[PDB]
Amino acid sequence: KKKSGVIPXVXHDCHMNXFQFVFTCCS
């Protein structure tokens, strides 16, 4: 269970995606 959706726009290059959180990012 990876796909959760913590906070979209927290990654380092996130640009509105939400694919998976490898370390908190949403890309």
UniProtKB/Swiss-Prot annotation:
It is found in: Secreted. Maturation of lantibiotics involves the enzymatic conversion of Thr, and Ser into dehydrated AA and the formation of thioether bonds with cysteine. This is followed by membrane translocation and cleavage of the modified precursor. The modification 2,3-didehydrobutyrine is found at T24. There is a cross-link at X11-C25, X18-C26 (Lanthionine (Ser-Cys)). There is a cross-link at X9-C14 (Beta-methyllanthionine (Thr-Cys)). Belongs to the type A lantibiotic family. Lanthionine-containing peptide antibiotic (lantibiotic) active on Gram-positive bacteria, such as Lactobacillus sakei, Leuconostoc mesenteroides and Pediococcus pentosaceus. The bactericidal activity of lantibiotics is based on depolarization of energized bacterial cytoplasmic membranes, initiated by the formation of aqueous transmembrane pores. This is Lantibiotic nukacin. The lineage of its organism: Bacteria, Bacillati, Bacillota, Bacilli, Bacillales. The gene is nukA. The chain holds residues 31 to 57 of 57 of the full protein.
